[PDB]
């Protein structure tokens, strides 16, 4: 059995990984060694204790990886580094994992001698898990995206802030909501007044999220005009698919909405050729066992294609599939997927399973 | 002075109209006659009293219009019908108003003898107020839209449901949020559990909105696969611009999010010709006095381009302006606008002002 080290297993992403691993009994397949950054278990900074392991799985973050990874590689360590952080995604000796989509790229990398496997961007990996069949069959020319991102991608304190903001908004008009006769405009004026107040908690977001939205995620990239999160659409979709020689354009706007764990995305996909709707539905459905084609009907979309339904599950529903008014080569698609699972911990758990097998 | 009748002035849209008219002292320029549907002030069903007026302004709704309008027209009535409802929009003797955008179309209709003026679709009106300059200079080939719609477009009870939903979500984890050391995963499990519960109020939406989203607005139109709200993009943008002979494709997905009265929209605009970014910003900015070009910077986007900022104001900010990866002919734009104002009561108030002058 492989001796595997775990760092950042107590954080949010790390906790989801521990729970998923426990659920699938992944621990009876390896020898787990747990690390801690605390001085109050082995030290996550002890390069010699980390050198003894076959595989290192980290959910600690970029600031840790950027400190520890180069120091450990400097000792001659030929083991595997599995990372949930973004820090190493864009290095040449690193492959971005999402096995139901890029199993061939990972298999070629294990053969080539790649020792660093990093999980992908949440929105990009959730997009590929949904619309993956179109990429396999080379039907994608370009994709325009508009995201509906949850607070979890920004962190734990961010989820708490959103909930606190939601509560303070209702509390502001609690008495008025009780009587069915009260003025709706008055209620609105009071909720907007509370949203705008000095004591309204906006420290983690820098703006109100509950009852609103924030059309900006991460630092600006002056060269393209994109934000770091928006840039990961072009950069990562092509790195995951091994298409760095023939880059398919994926660009759009990344917006933060008041949801807890699920990222939703609206797509305008330009197909290379004109195909029937019934065929496109079967091509999407056949790619993997997690994707779910939701028929363009009201009651079923309301019940299936929402964060309410998908939260805490591995299911990746895709729906609102129809041809757009620009041409029969323009497809409309809307998807919903859990950020902490396929967008964070699940591709990490799955590459580990392959490595310890 | 013109004798003007007001129907549905106590509803939500009608109340915003009364407030705006009062704020602009519009009552000093006309003779107001108020109608009611109540049997507990003139009757909104008394065709003879309605026949005496020069103009009828209604925010009552489609079920009123469809009953009263044909009856009153059958008596030989020469006056004007100004409607906030959707009922008459697609009729040949009716023009869809939004004067900062279609003043020429309205003037030509007054000189042609058109007697019915109907306010337009909220999302379409808010889009045209934002990027009107691009339609003026005939730079738009097609537009793909992804909307972030407020609860107000669905009505008063819907806004109340959203607020009640937000409240029950925080209340479910009230003491856990006060404790800075509590588990985030435990918190989300409880919030998701309450969102999923039987007693959680989802009556008006048919699904949870607070902490979630609903990617379906209005009835299915089996013909194109679009929803009735999505269809209004193609149909209404062209009727407002008088381009029913040469239709510019506007299509996309209409999604309901947890916002009160501001609709936000993400666009992928395909320009006919390749123009510089610094020039595209000036063209959008110079179209009308309400649009506001927000520079592509973080602190300013957070402060300006949000429902929190624009709610209850006539300001229509447009931002996140950049060239997309598909080519320099592809522009990205994000806009926010108050649904009750430019998307409902404001175009109605404005055509009335022109009619009574």
Swiss-Prot record, chains A, B:
GO molecular function, one term: protein dimerization activity
Keywords: Amino-acid biosynthesis, Diaminopimelate biosynthesis, Lysine biosynthesis, Methionine biosynthesis, NADP, Oxidoreductase, Threonine biosynthesis
Domain notes: Consists of two domains, an N-terminal nucleotide-binding domain and a C-terminal dimerization domain.
Entries under PROSITE patterns matching the protein: ASD
Record note on what altering residue 89 to K does: 2-fold increase in affinity for ASA, 23-fold decrease in affinity for phosphate, and 275-fold decrease in activity
Enzyme class, UniProt record, top EC level: oxidoreductase
Official protein name in the record: Aspartate-semialdehyde dehydrogenase
NADP recorded as keyword: yes
Record function comment: Catalyzes the NADPH-dependent formation of L-aspartate-semialdehyde (L-ASA) by the reductive dephosphorylation of L-aspartyl-4-phosphate.
Annotated residues for binding of substrate: 149, 229, 256
Active site: 122, 263
Gene Ontology biological-process annotations: 'de novo' L-methionine biosynthetic process; diaminopimelate biosynthetic process; isoleucine biosynthetic process; lysine biosynthetic process via diaminopimelate; threonine biosynthetic process
PANTHER family (alphabetical): ASPARTATE-SEMIALDEHYDE DEHYDROGENASE, DEHYDROGENASE, PUTATIVE-RELATED
Family from the record: Belongs to the aspartate-semialdehyde dehydrogenase family.
Entry keyword Lyase: no
Residues involved in NADP(+) binding: 10-13, 37-38, 60, 152, 339
